[PDB]
């Protein structure tokens, strides 16, 4: 501080200033997101797919900043996504809007040893009565609209219009094939990207769905010993053309000899490894192809790690290079294996159905990934929100319809308590409007208009805005009795977690 030396990225002014500033400015995404929005972010991690996103996690994945809080705080926001898929586009803006509320009190000179407490105290008071404002619950998880209702806040939060069929599709996916007894799996039920068809045509094909081509035959038996090999067939010794015509009529044969009789013993020992399906991370040679069909081994011409990973995951596989007679440490998991036409594409389908280890797989059909990923993003954050492992989601008013409910809870409780925390608690009664504004922003009105008319509804529970004409002038969309609902789980987290972030980030001076 008074030294030429030592270190800091934070402190003094900065702690009061820079640590609050950009952490807020992060919220611009979540300021436009979480709840129905057409507003999106083109995020180019340079993939040659230029990625539309409102999802904070993969917005913040690129974002890097010297502000130690904003450096850190994305942790709690990403620690959130781990715990709930939805509510994450809520996390960053709420505290971010709740932050400079304290900084204004810092301009008033209300201490860091003071203000955040009242937040934390009203963070209690929230999570105290936050379970009281729980209303519904998602009970039968085989049921569509108990699942698709939770989904109907969550995908909605990420993205608006596509949500409805997705919610159906995701509930029609029956992520309840996992009994949700404490069981859920992100790889077993997986997204499978299919270029073309519709995204309304995007389906759930149970099993493991590989848009990669099943080559030659299908499995000998449906309980396969699944040969998942990074390079089982790279070719053994390749043919050549020398003269821009032929090299030599004589030199042609000996390389097929090495190719064939190796890939003979190769695929014969792909048969002697007992592989019913050989799953090739690399290419296939037509000789091994011929061998894969004679030796009766389902062949997959090419495999992305997307296959190989889930293969290693599900099958117990290890994707292996082979120029040699193999052995299966992969074996199978699967009770069924197929070439099915899904996306109306010939698809490598590994399959079985159980409660546990069961692969029941989303198949997304879309012209691009930016279609099939951000929507998947929108999708899976409901699938993620489906993951509670308390089967009843304890559905609160969705669409953030509990804002106005807790808002008058906290502001009345901020009236009760004396001392500077009464402000902080009343300041905690404030940042509610962020998403109602974030809605009203992408909807196009100020939360004041919204929230004051929803200060007129007082205790309501149902009405809260979104992206819609109802969210502009009427200040009302019915987000409790809706079809649009959200679990108490992410309610337990985001209010606390975004606080857990905001706790010490003003305290950190160095």
């Amino acid at each position: 501080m008074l030294k030429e030396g030592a270190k800091h990225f934070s402190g003094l002014e900065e702690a009061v200033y820079r640590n609050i500033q950009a952490c807020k400015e992060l919220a611009q995404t979540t300021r436009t997101a979480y709840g129905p929005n057409g507003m999106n972010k083109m995020v180019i991690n340079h993939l040659e797919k230029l990625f539309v996103t409102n999802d904070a996690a993969t917005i913040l994945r690129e974002l890097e900043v010297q502000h130690p809080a904003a450096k850190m705080i994305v942790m709690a926001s990403h620690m959130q996504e781990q715990e709930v898929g939805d509510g994450t586009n809520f996390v960053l803006v709420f505290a971010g809007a709740l932050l400079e509320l304290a900084e204004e009190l810092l301009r008033i000179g209300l201490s860091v040893s003071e203000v955040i407490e009242g937040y934390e105290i009203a963070c209690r008071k929230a999570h105290e009565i936050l379970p009281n404002l729980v209303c519904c619950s998602a009970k039968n998880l085989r049921d569509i609209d108990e699942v698709s209702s939770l989904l109907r806040t969550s995908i909605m939060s990420k993205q608006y219009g596509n949500e409805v069929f997705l919610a159906k599709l995701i509930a029609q996916a029956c992520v309840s094939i996992f009994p949700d007894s404490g069981h859920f799996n992100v790889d077993n039920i997986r997204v499978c990207k299919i270029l073309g068809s519709g995204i309304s045509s995007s389906s759930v094909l149970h099993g493991m769905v590989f848009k990669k081509e099943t080559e030659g035959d299908v499995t000998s038996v449906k309980d396969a010993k699944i040969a998942v090999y990074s390079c089982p067939f790279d070719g053994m010794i390749t043919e050549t053309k020398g003269t821009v015509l032929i090299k030599t009529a004589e030199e042609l044969m000996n390389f097929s000899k090495g190719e064939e009789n190796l890939m003979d013993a190769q695929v014969k020992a792909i048969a002697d490894t007992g592989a019913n399906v050989v799953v090739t991370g690399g290419k296939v040679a037509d000789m091994a192809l011929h061998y894969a069909n004679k030796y009766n081994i389902m062949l997959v011409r090419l495999n992305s790690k997307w296959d190989l990973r889930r293969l290693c995951k599900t099958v117990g596989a290890t994707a292996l290079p082979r120029l040699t007679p193999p052995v299966l440490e992969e074996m199978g998991h699967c009770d069924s294996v197929y070439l099915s036409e899904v996306g109306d594409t010939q698809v490598v389908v590994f399959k079985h159905e159980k409660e546990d280890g069961a692969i029941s797989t989303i198949v997304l059909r879309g012209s691009t990934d930016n279609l099939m990923d951000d929507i998947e993003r929108a999708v899976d954050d409901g699938v993620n929100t489906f993951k509670v492992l308390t089967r009843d989601k304890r559905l609160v008013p969705g669409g953030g319809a509990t804002e106005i409910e807790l808002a008058k809870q906290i502001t009345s409780y901020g009236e009760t308590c004396p001392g500077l925390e009464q402000y902080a608690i009343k300041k905690f009664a404030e940042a509610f409007e962020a998403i109602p504004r974030a809605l009203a922003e992408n909807s196009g009105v100020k939360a004041n208009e919204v929230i004051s008319k929803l200060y007129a509804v007082h205790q309501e529970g149902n009405k809260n805005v979104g992206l819609d004409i109802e969210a502009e002038v009427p200040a009302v969309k019915d987000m409790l009795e809706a079809g649009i609902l959200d679990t108490y789980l992410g309610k337990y987290w985001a209010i606390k977690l975004a606080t857990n972030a905001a706790v010490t980030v003003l305290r950190v001076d160095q």
Partner: protein, 512 residues
């Protein structure tokens, strides 16, 4: 790891998207200035449209890349509709920029786009008119008059009406695709304009003269055609060698053993199945000497676009060797007939076992008229094929474009709000398209456009400004004829191609 937030990046997106439309402003009716564009590769780069230079231009913008890909999403389908989508979505983006400062920014942004784009397609298929085989035309007489639409619209001459049926021949023969990759067209310098030809298979413009080329057959009724992606020349297999001499007997030999292989190379396909051998790559003296020793046909340096469509036509395969090849990999016709047309040694390939190729042969006896019609053939093709595919035929040239924005100016009254601004912008976008072909018609756009509006307060059936006639009147009755399908296509693009990035004013980029 870079982003610009808010309106500043948003508005910044449009011009990068718009400037390319300022090129295509009217590139369909071509007239304007065309600069030969030489890129950093030394490549002189031009187009018959906007898309090919769009193919050539790249941006770091996602935005400017989107409508590119979108116009390309519209391009490769019809082969057309690029400039249309290129102008319209950018025009939306162009027009919302002042609105953006007022703000459209609430996601009242995206709604009236697609909400009003259905109103168009709601008007499209209700005003759409379907064509058939017995209907007003053979559907060949349509594809005649849709060629007479597409061919004649640009000039040329009554061969445009002659070609109008003639282009439809290989069309009807091959009609599956919207485009010619089976069909193709053979440019003929020589003959004359009044006769242009069509072959039920590929017909090679020229194959190439050698030693013994005259002494090799120019005619087969039973071509078994080695289709070569690969050359056979004196360089292909060397004649150079040497050997030790205390006796000069071996001078003949050490060259002759290599000589036998040049022979054997070409002969081994010749011996196996091959009469005709078509190489797309050179044939040199000592090789063609053996090809002249064979007198089963030799070719080299021939078009592969014909040679691979010969594979399509024949049923043989493009051959990467002269050896290791069977008799089935050989192309086959019931006609190999080489009768030189002009300077083109002209191989008749017809009677193919399949004849997936049927190629129209445009014969001009001169260079200019052809490439104008050959450009109008793609026009005809992109139309006459699609005129079959979608028999429902809308009309262009501000037919509905002025008639839609007519109602879509009329649709403004019921909107009011923030998106009534969009409605007007959405409306006149339809009319900014003919707003050029007016100039290509020599017309002032706006008065003519306003006339057309009045003409759509009077008429409004097909009425529009047609650079086709350089008039203002019914398009479909002016023989402005294109299927109504591409409309929805373009209009699915038009409003939606714009709404992508305007949904994003915060655009992140990364080095990785």
């Amino acid at each position: 790891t870079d982003s610009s937030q808010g309106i500043p990046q948003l508005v910044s997106n449009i011009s990068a998207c718009q400037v390319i439309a300022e090129a295509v402003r009217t590139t369909l009716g071509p007239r304007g200035m065309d600069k030969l564009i030489v890129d950093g590769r030394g490549k002189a780069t031009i187009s018959n449209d906007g898309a090919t230079i769009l193919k050539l231009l790249d941006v770091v913008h996602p935005a400017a890349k989107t409508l590119v890909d979108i116009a390309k999403s519209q391009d490769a389908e019809v082969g057309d509709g690029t400039t249309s989508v290129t102008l319209l979505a950018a025009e939306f983006l162009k027009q919302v920029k002042p609105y953006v400062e007022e703000g459209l920014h609430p996601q009242i942004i995206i709604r009236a786009f697609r909400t009003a784009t259905q109103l168009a397609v709601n008007k499209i298929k209700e005003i759409a008119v379907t064509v058939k085989k017995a209907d007003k035309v053979e559907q060949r007489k349509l594809l005649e008059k849709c060629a007479m639409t597409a061919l004649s619209s640009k000039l040329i001459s009554q061969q445009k009406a002659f070609f109008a049926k003639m282009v439809v021949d290989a069309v009807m023969m091959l009609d599956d695709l919207l485009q010619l990759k089976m069909i193709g067209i053979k440019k003929v310098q020589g003959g004359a304009l009044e006769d242009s030809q069509l072959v039920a298979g590929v017909a090679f413009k020229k194959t190439f003269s050698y030693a013994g080329f005259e002494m090799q057959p120019k005619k087969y009724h039973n071509p078994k055609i080695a289709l070569l992606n690969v050359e056979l020349e004196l360089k292909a297999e060397k004649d150079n060698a040497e050997i030790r001499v205390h006796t000069v007997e071996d001078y003949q030999a050490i060259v002759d053993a290599e000589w036998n292989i040049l022979y054997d190379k070409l002969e081994k396909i010749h011996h196996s199945g091959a009469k005709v051998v078509l190489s797309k790559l050179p044939i040199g003296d000592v090789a063609t000497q053996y090809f002249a020793d064979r007198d089963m046909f030799c070719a080299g340096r021939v078009p592969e676009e014909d040679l691979k469509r010969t594979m399509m036509a024949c049923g043989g395969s493009i051959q990467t060797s002269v050896n290791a090849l069977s008799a089935d990999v050989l192309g086959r016709c019931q006609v190999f007939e080489e009768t030189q047309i002009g300077g083109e040694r002209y191989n008749f390939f017809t009677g193919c076992p399949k004849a997936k190729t049927c190629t129209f042969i445009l014969r001009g006896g001169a260079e200019q008229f052809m490439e104008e019609t050959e450009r109008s053939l793609h026009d005809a093709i992109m139309i006459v094929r699609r005129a079959i595919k979608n028999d429902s035929v809308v009309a262009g040239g501000g037919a509905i474009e002025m008639e839609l924005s007519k109602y879509l100016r009329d649709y403004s009254r019921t909107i009011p709000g923030k998106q009534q601004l969009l409605i007007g912008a959405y409306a006149k976008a339809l009319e900014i398209i003919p707003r050029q072909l007016c100039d290509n018609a020599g017309f002032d756009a706006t008065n003519i456009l306003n006339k057309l509006r009045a003409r759509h307060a009077q008429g409004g059936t097909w009425y529009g400004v047609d650079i086709n006639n350089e008039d203002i009147a019914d398009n479909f009755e002016a023989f402005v004829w294109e299927p109504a399908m591409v409309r929805i296509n373009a209009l699915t693009a038009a409003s939606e191609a714009a709404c992508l990035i305007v949904s994003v004013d915060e655009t992140i980029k990364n080095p990785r």
